Amino acid sequence: DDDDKKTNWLKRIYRVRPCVKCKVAPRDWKVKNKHLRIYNMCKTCFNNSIDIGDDTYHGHVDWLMYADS
């Protein structure tokens, strides 16, 4: 089944690239209509970044959750 290929790709993508900042915590994410949005940082790092004023790592990649558009 094709939808599973997307799912496993996304599971893998989320598992193998940790937070860009601390490099250990997994990343924050949220679901939005039909996309999975993976943010560049974990929450701890993201809130920290606001506190220290660095917007360098801000950002996300949106992923289509299904095999067909």
Ligand X SMILES: Nc1ncnc2c1ncn2[C@@H]1O[C@H](COP(=O)(O)OP(=O)(O)O)[C@@H](O)[C@H]1O
Contact flag: residue 35 with ligand X (CB under 6 A): no
Q: Beta strands 35-39 and 60-64: pairing type?
A: antiparallel
Q: How far apart are CA 15 and CA 41, in angstroms?
A: 13
Contact flag: residue 56 with a copy of itself (CB under 8 A): no
Distance of closest approach, residue 20 Cβ to a copy of itself, in angstroms: 9
Task: Please report, for the chain, how many H helices and E strands are present, in that order.
Answer: 2, 3
Q: Strand, helix or coil at 3?
A: helix
Considering only residues 40 to 69 of the shown chain, the ones binding ligand X according to CB under 6 A are: 40-41, 43, 46, 57-60
Contact flag: residue 57 with a copy of itself (CB under 8 A): no
Contact flag: residue 55 with a copy of itself (CB under 8 A): no
